[PDB]
Amino acid sequence: TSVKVVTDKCTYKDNELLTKYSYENAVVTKTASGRFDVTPTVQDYVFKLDLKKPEKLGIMLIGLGGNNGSTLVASVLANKHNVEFQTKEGVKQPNYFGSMTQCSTLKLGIDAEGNDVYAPFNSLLPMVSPNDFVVSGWDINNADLYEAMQRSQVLEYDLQQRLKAKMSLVKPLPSIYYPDFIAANQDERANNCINLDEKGNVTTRGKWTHLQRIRRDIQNFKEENALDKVIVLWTANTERYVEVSPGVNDTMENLLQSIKNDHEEIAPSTIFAAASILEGVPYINGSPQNTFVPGLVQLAEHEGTFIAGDDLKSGQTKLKSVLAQFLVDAGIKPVSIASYNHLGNNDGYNLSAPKSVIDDIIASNDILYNDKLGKKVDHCIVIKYMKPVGDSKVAMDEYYSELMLGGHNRISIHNVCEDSLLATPLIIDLLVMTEFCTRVSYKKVDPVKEDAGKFENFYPVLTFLSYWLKAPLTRPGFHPVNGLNKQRTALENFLRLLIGLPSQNELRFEERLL
């Protein structure tokens, strides 16, 4: 399945794709008089898409032995080998449900009877299939992917048994472990580390050597498997936030120096990220950690390496975003939002250890939210640990909106699902989109000089992945976009413009006019 657009904006050459595009926008300036001044903005571009996708993509997850890690590898094997499995409801076939890049579709246009015609998200342009993912990684635990899969209690027993043979062969490489960055209760799982002293005890000494190790591990993995492309995705337990101290991790030279001196400010995630950047490998942070300190970000810009991340954005977080937006777009003013969640996996255990979307929506509607009628919105996030629930997550949200004439509206949302079975599919999307973006270059074409300038690459921070990130990383200055649906459309239009197609207008003048 493929798509071909007949447009004079797209041309080929040496197995590549060149396309012109006029980026239209507009700058605004509010007048104290209460008048908006909009001045349209135009900027022609020329995008180059590397039409040669890797025959096999290399994926290295930090926390391979975890729920997502094991589930990911499992999904890849089951799907690639069509490993059907027995279930209480009969024999089921493997699939990537939950993956918008694998099971979603986009509207290309209309047909004869002016009806909308859709095509798979990955049919517009060549993208790497997860079935071609060569997965490996690190993890402070030596349990093979079969054992790791059993303790995760995520997949059917039968499916696990049919994958047992293969899974048992995959062992996660030893990793870096600095106790002062996670739950004090990890000393038992931590039995697969590279940072061990002469005797054999965990040590935060020799961080630079650790970085050297991860670098080598990347190289070896890429060598053992005739691979050219590799992607590092952090899916390990959450680390504690790190202090951004000046003269330590604020600039490039400092960061690397800090590591060499084993500065306390350097977390293991910091080392993994740095090692990935130094190897030209795109690093993706799927955890709530300020891993990308100004130092690393600077190093990324320099090396021209890709970095994206900060929390995988759960499926429930996506709902809260949609619901909230919906209400406010309809003129409904939510006054209170209660979100109480609780699960029982090793993830929610690390959280409970004894030792903003809503904000943007408010600033967008000064009608409902202002000093005269109120500019605040109560919201609380709760996450309790309940082991006797398993990976099955229970999400509960309560929206109390203010309606016309003293009226009120209360919406109760009860979400229940196998937490890992949502994140995994999502992680696949990030991987798929990351490598795709790697094969994309752009040139800011001006009107006065022909062929002026060479092709550049996407800004180090792939904001185009904010759809799968709870805390979208943004370059100094710009404000992150949290509008889920808007992030979804951004992708559509992006893929569209690449094949010579304008933005969706939904004006359907074919029907409304004539």
Ligand X SMILES: NC(=O)c1ccc[n+]([C@@H]2O[C@H](COP(=O)([O-])OP(=O)(O)OC[C@H]3O[C@@H](n4cnc5c(N)ncnc54)[C@H](O)[C@@H]3O)[C@@H](O)[C@H]2O)c1
Annotated binding site: 65-68, 139, 175-176, 186-187, 189, 235-238, 286-287, 311-312, 314, 345-347, 390-391, 419-420
- Of residues 344-373, those binding a copy of itself (CB under 8 A): 360, 363-368, 373
Distance of CA 245 to CAs 81, 250, 476, 481, Å?
Answer: 49, 7, 17, 27
For residue 403, give the DSSP letter: P
Q: Tell me if 237 contacts ligand X by CB under 6 A.
A: yes
Least CB distance to ligand X at residue 219 (A):
19
Contact pattern for a copy of itself over residues 491 through 510, marking x by CB under 8 A? --xx--x-xxxxxxxxxxxx
In one letter, which amino acid is 348?
Answer: G
Tokens of 419: 């937490």
Least CB distance to ligand X at residue 312 (A):
4
Q: Which does 504 bind (CB under 5 to 8 A by kind): ligand X, a copy of itself, none?
A: a copy of itself
Q: Tell me if 429 contacts ligand X by CB under 6 A.
A: no
318 close to 342: Cβ distance less than 8 angstroms: no
Q: Is 30 helix (H, G, I), strand (E, B) or coil?
A: strand
Q: Is 298 helix (H, G, I), strand (E, B) or coil?
A: helix
Largest CA-CA distance found in the chain, in angstroms, rounded: 83
In one letter, which amino acid is 160?
Answer: Q
- Whole-angstrom distance, CA of residue 110 vs CA of residue 99: 25
Relative to beta strand 35-50, strand 440-443 is: antiparallel
- Whole-angstrom distance, CA of residue 428 vs CA of residue 461: 18
Sole binder of a copy of itself in the list 20, 203, 384, 445 (CB under 8 A) = 384
Closest-CA residue to 399 (of 376, 380, 374, 371): 380
Q: Which does 371 bind (CB under 5 to 8 A by kind): a copy of itself, ligand X, none?
A: none
Q: Tell me if 14 contacts a copy of itself by CB under 8 A.
A: no
In sequence order, the 6+-apart residues with CB closer than 8 A to the CB of 297 are 307, 460, 461
Q: Tell me if 212 contacts a copy of itself by CB under 8 A.
A: no
How is 158-198 classified by DSSP, letter by letter? Answer: HHHHHHHHHHHH--PBPB---GGGS-STTTTT---BS-B-S
356 close to 376: Cβ distance less than 8 angstroms: no
Long-range interactions of 367-372: CB distance < 8 A, separation 24+:
367/331, 368/328, 368/331, 368/333, 369/333
Sole binder of ligand X in the list 10, 53, 59, 69 (CB under 6 A) = 69
Q: What residues are designated binding site for NAD(+)?
A: 65-68, 139, 175-176, 186-187, 189, 235-238, 286-287, 311-312, 314, 345-347, 390-391, 419-420
Sole binder of ligand X in the list 75, 99, 136, 235 (CB under 6 A) = 235
- Which of 309-317, 334-342, 354-362, 432-440 is the region at the interface with ligand X (rule: CB under 6 A)? 309-317
Q: Which does 101 bind (CB under 5 to 8 A by kind): ligand X, a copy of itself, none?
A: a copy of itself
Q: Is 39 helix (H, G, I), strand (E, B) or coil?
A: strand
- Which of 25-33, 98-106, 299-307, 310-318 is the region at the interface with ligand X (rule: CB under 6 A)? 310-318
Q: Tell me if 238 contacts ligand X by CB under 6 A.
A: yes
Q: Tell me if 419 contacts ligand X by CB under 6 A.
A: yes
Which residue, 132 or 243, is less far from a copy of itself as judged by CB?
132
Q: Is 93 helix (H, G, I), strand (E, B) or coil?
A: coil
- Of residues 129-168, those binding a copy of itself (CB under 8 A): 150, 153-159
Sole binder of a copy of itself in the list 52, 216, 302, 479 (CB under 8 A) = 479
Which residue, 10 or 231, is less far from ligand X as judged by CB?
231
Number of residues that bind a copy of itself (CB under 8 A): 169
Q: Which does 482 bind (CB under 5 to 8 A by kind): a copy of itself, ligand X, none?
A: none
Least CB distance to a copy of itself at residue 228 (A):
25
Breaks (C-N over 2.5 A) in the chain follow: 355
Q: Which does 287 bind (CB under 5 to 8 A by kind): ligand X, a copy of itself, none?
A: ligand X
Q: Tell me if 139 contacts ligand X by CB under 6 A.
A: yes
Distance of CA 49 to CAs 52, 64, 436, Å?
Answer: 9, 31, 9
Q: Tell me if 312 contacts ligand X by CB under 6 A.
A: yes
Least CB distance to ligand X at residue 192 (A):
8
268 close to 177: Cβ distance less than 8 angstroms: yes
Closest-CA residue to 49 (of 13, 80, 83, 74): 13
Which residue, 54 or 390, is less far from ligand X as judged by CB?
390
- Of residues 67-126, those binding a copy of itself (CB under 8 A): 74-75, 78, 85-90, 92-105, 107-120, 123
Give me the phi and psi of 335, to 5 degrees please: -105, -20
Sole binder of ligand X in the list 10, 19, 60, 63 (CB under 6 A) = 63
Distance of CA 308 to CAs 124, 265, 408, 504, Å?
Answer: 24, 21, 40, 27
Q: Tell me if 24 contacts a copy of itself by CB under 8 A.
A: yes
- Rule CB under 6 A: which residues touch ligand X? 62-63, 65-69, 138-141, 175-177, 182, 189, 235-238, 268, 286-288, 311-312, 314, 345-347, 419-420, 422-423
